[PDB]
C-alpha cells in the first residue's frame, strides 16, 4: 500500500535523495572546494546510475556552478563547445554521405568476396575492416554502420540452427570490439582520445609531443596486437579452432561453400556499378585522411609550414570542417521542368539526423565540470591529499589508476569516465614528480576498454540492441578482451612507449 | 543545352563565383582587416541569398577565421555556445512539454473563442501582448514564451477554416512569426531592464557621467514609450499591408460563426485539463515569475540573495532550472502498475523539436561577431565615424544611427553598442552638445536589428518554426527599421529635447 509506490518512482526518489543527502557537504563547509565536490558527486552519481539522461546530467554544471558562485554562467557556457565538436560535425558530414550512398555496403561486400565465407577468416576480415574504418570515423558511427551489413551478410551465409546463433553472437561481438580497438589508433578516432588531447594541450601548452604521427606510432602496435588476440579469443570462445579447415588453401571444393559464396556475389552484383556519389565520398574520405596525416607529423612539415606564422590556429577540426562542408555543396541529383535545382549530396535535414547532439552536450558538460573543478581549487586539494601516495613504486600507481578507470568505464560512458579522472590524475602526476604522460596514456587507453556491459559505450549498446547477445555471453568475452587490452597496454608502456616519449624522467613542460 | 545547365546549377556556381570574386580583397589591402571583411561579406552573401543552408553558412567562420590567422580554432569553437544556448535549451524543454500534452491547443482555442477571430486585429493583439511582456522579462525570453501560443492560434484558425467542406495560411504564418519577432518596440526600448542594450548603456552612462542622475525608470519610459508605440503601430500597419490585403470596407455574418462553431467543437473535444498540462502550465508561470523577479530595477529581486557573485546566475540559469525538471517529474505510469513511471519529456522527444539549426546559426553569428572584434574590422568601421566634427548637429546623429542599425544586423545588440558607445561619447564631448543627444538615438537604433535573423536572438527563436525564407524577413525588416529610425529621429527632434535639455551643453559633462 506504501512500499509499492517506492519501487515504482525509483528514479525520482533516488534523484531527490542524492540531491538532499549530499547537501550537508556545501551547506556547512563554506568553501568552493566543497561546493564543487558536491556538484562533482551529483554529476558522477547521475552518470553512473543513469537516473537522469546523460546529456541532462551534463547540463547540471551550468546550473550548479553559477549558483554556487564558482564561475559565471557566461564562462560555463563557453566550455560546452570545443574543437572536438567541430571535428565531430565534420566527420558526421562524411559518415552521413557514406551511409546514404551505400559505400560501406560496397566495401563490406567486396571484403567478404575477397576473404571468403570461412567463419574463422570472415570474422577476422570483419574485425579488420571495422577497425580500419573506426580509425577515422567515430566508434559509435562505425558500429552503427558496419553491424547492419555484418548481420545481413551473416544471415544470408547461414541460410545458404545449433551453429547459426553462436555465429551471429560472434559477429555481433567482433564488430562491437573491433570498432573500439580501431578507435585507439588515432587521436580523431574516438571521443576519448580527442578529450584527452584537448585536456593535455590546454593544461600543458608547452608540450609538442601529441600529434597524429606520434600518437599512431605507439597506438598502432598495441592496437594490432589487441585486435589479433581478441579475434583469437573470440574464435576460440564461440566457435573453436579447426586449423586444418582454416589454413588450407582453395583446394577442397565443397558444394555448400560456393552455395554461400554465390549469394554474396549475387548481392554484390545487385548493388550495381559504382556511382559517382560513392566515388566523390571515397575521394573526400581519402583527402580528409591525407590532410589529417599531412599536418606536421614530425619529419616533414606537410602543410602546417604553409601557415607558419599563426601556429596552432588551423587544426584537425579545420580539416574535418573543410571536407565535411563540401558534402553540402557537391551536386548529386537534379530536381528544367519543375524546380530547376539540384541536391547537395547531403541535406542539412539528413545531417541533423545521425548527428550525436546528446554526445556533444555530454562532452561539453564534462568539459565544463572539469573547468569548474580547476577554477574552484578542488583539483589542487585532491592533488595535495594524494601527495603521500608518491612514496609507492611508480608502476603500481599507473596499474591501480588503469584498473580503476577500466572498472568504472564498464558502467559509465567513455567521455564521462575520461572527464572525471583527467582533473584527478593530472594533478596527481606532479604530486609524485613523475611524467604526466606516463600515467595519462595508460589511463586514456584503458578508458576505451569498455567491453563488458552494453551500457559501457554506445558501440556495445548498438550491437546488443539486435537481441542476439545475452549479458553473460557478452561479459565472458569482454573479460578476456579487457584483460588482453590491459596486458598489451602495460607491456607497451614498459617496452616501447618510453623511448619515444621519454617517460622515465620528469619533463620540462610539467609544473614543479 | 548550356543555359539550362547554368540555370540548374546556379547555387553551386554562385558559391564558387562569390568565393573567387571577393578573393582579391584578402590578398591586397594590407591583408590585416580585409580578411575578416572578406569572411563577413561571404557569410552575409550566403545568408541573404540562401545558396547554402543557413547552418552550413554559420560554420564558415569556424573555417575561414582560423585559416586567415584572425583567431585560433579553439577560440572560434567556444563561440558557438553561450547563455543564449542554455536559455534555448531551457525554453525548448518547456515547449516540448507544452506541445506534447496539447496545452498550446487549449490556450489557442480559448483565445480564439475569447478574442480575435479576425486576423487583422489578432496580429495587433499579438504584437501588443508581446511588446507589453517584453517590457519586463526580456526580448529573447518573450519571443520564446509566446511564439508557441501564436503558432498554435494560427494553426487552429487554419484548421478551422475548412468550414466543414493554403496560400493564405502560409502568409498568415509568416506574418504572425515576424510580428512576434519584431515586437521588441514597446518591450525592449521603454525600460532599462527590458533588454541588455539599455542596461549596458545605463551602466556606461552612470559611470562616465556620475553627476547625471537623469536615467532611471519613468524618465526612460517617458521618452521611450511615445516612440515605441508609434513604431509598433506603424510596424503593424506595414506588416498587414506587406503580407495581407488592403482591407477597408467591413471595419467601419455566417462565415465567422461557421468557424466559431468548429472552434467550439474542437475545444470541447479536448476535455478537462490533465495533470501533465497543469504541471506544464505551473512551470511555465514559475519560469516567467523567476525571470521577472531577478532584477526588476524598481525593487530588489532574488539576485540580491546572491549579492556576493554579481551576474553569475542569469536568466539562462532560471531556464535550465525550470526546464530540467521536465526530465524527472512523472507524467504517466508504465498489479496494475508494471515496473515504473515515465517523465514529462524524454531526451528522445527533446532532441527532436530542438532547433539544432538555430543553435548553430546563432553560434556562427557569435563567432563572426567575435572575429570582427579580434581583427579590428568593427573598430575600423567605428573609427571611420569619429572624424565627422564638421557636421553641425544632426547629420552626425543620422550617420551614427544608420551605422549602428546597419552593424547590428550581423553582431549582437550588446556587442554593437559596447563598441560604438565609447566611440560616440568622446565624439559628443569634443562637440559642445549634450552627449545624451548623441547617445540616445544610437542606443535606440542598436536594438533595431530586424534584418538577418542571425543577429537578434528574438529573430531566431521565431525563425526556428520552418519559415526559413530570409528574403521574406528582409523585406519586412527593411520597412520596420526605416520606421524605427524615422520615429527615433522625430522623437529626438520634437519631444525628447525638453525633458533632457538636448539643445544646451549640461553641467555634468566635461568641458
Ligand atoms: Na572510431
Ligand atoms: Na565506457
Ligand atoms: Na525585452
Ligand atoms: Na543584433
Curated annotation (Swiss-Prot), chain A:
It catalyses: sulfate(out) + 3 Na(+)(out) = sulfate(in) + 3 Na(+)(in); selenate(out) + 3 Na(+)(out) = selenate(in) + 3 Na(+)(in); thiosulfate(out) + 3 Na(+)(out) = thiosulfate(in) + 3 Na(+)(in). The chain crosses the membrane at residues 12-32, 40-60, 76-96, 107-127, 130-150, 170-190, 221-241, 279-299, 312-332, 388-408, 415-435, 436-456, 478-498. It holds the Pfam family Na_sulph_symp. Keywords: Cell membrane, Glycoprotein, Ion transport, Membrane, Sodium, Sodium transport, Sulfate transport, Symport, Transmembrane, Transmembrane helix, Transport. Highly expressed in kidney; not detectable in the other tissues tested. One of its GO terms (molecular function) is monoatomic anion:sodium symporter activity. Inhibited by thiosulfate, selenate, molybdate, tungstate, citrate and succinate. It is a multi-pass membrane protein. It is found in: Apical cell membrane. One of its GO terms (cellular component) is plasma membrane. The keyword Cytoplasm does not apply. GO terms for biological process: sodium ion transport; sulfate transmembrane transport. InterPro entries: Na/sul_symport_CS, SLC13A/DASS. The keyword Membrane applies. Sodium:sulfate symporter that mediates sulfate reabsorption in the kidney and small intestine. Can also mediate the transport of selenate and thiosulfate. PANTHER family: SOLUTE CARRIER FAMILY 13 MEMBER, SOLUTE CARRIER FAMILY 13 MEMBER 1. Belongs to the SLC13A/DASS transporter (TC 2.A.47) family. NADC subfamily. This is Solute carrier family 13 member 1. It comes from Homo sapiens (Human).
